[PDB]
Amino acid sequence: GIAVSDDCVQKFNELKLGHQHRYVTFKMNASNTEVVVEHVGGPNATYEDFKSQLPERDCRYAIFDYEFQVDGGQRNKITFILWAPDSAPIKSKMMYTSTKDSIKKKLVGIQVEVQATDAAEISEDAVSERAKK
């Protein structure tokens, strides 16, 4: 029911098609009618730059273009992150849970999916483990 704004796609395509952003975060608009862009990370922005601003008691969506080395060769995984901390209100968790397939399906090209409910789960450690396979 919640719609996904076109700009969501648009920033996503920048990250994906032109490697313009390291990550894009998405949140429910004030009206709870659409999913909108929260933060755009620049191309050299860090993992900590993303993870540190995640709200302790609210949910978020994100796309992190996760980069790593396999035998010294460069690798990239477009990773889709569902942030849904245990402390977020029921209303919050229900809204993002119901809208996740819609956003994901519009964000063509997702290679890896992570769901995290706390600090260990959204750690770089846990996310790269998933990203490297």
CA nearest to 67, candidates 47, 37, 49, 38: 47
In contact, 54 and 66? CB cutoff 8 Å: no
Find the DSSP H helices in the chain: 6-18, 47-51, 90-106, 124-131
CA nearest to 96, candidates 57, 41, 45, 42: 57
State the Cα–Cα distance between residues 51 and 47, nearest whole angstrom: 6
**What resolution does the deposited structure have, in angstroms?**
2.2
What technique determined this structure?
X-ray
Beta strands in 29-128 (DSSP E): 34-40, 60-70, 73-83, 112-116
State the Cα–Cα distance between residues 124 and 10, nearest whole angstrom: 26
For 1-133, give the CATH class.
alpha beta
State the Cα–Cα distance between residues 112 and 31, nearest whole angstrom: 30
Under DSSP, the state recorded for 33 is: S
The number of C-alpha atoms within 13 Å of 38 and in the hemisphere containing its C-beta is 19
Measure Cα distances from 69 to 66, 77, 111, 119 in Å.
10, 11, 17, 24
State the Cα–Cα distance between residues 113 and 66, nearest whole angstrom: 11
State the Cα–Cα distance between residues 125 and 107, nearest whole angstrom: 24
State the Cα–Cα distance between residues 24 and 105, nearest whole angstrom: 16
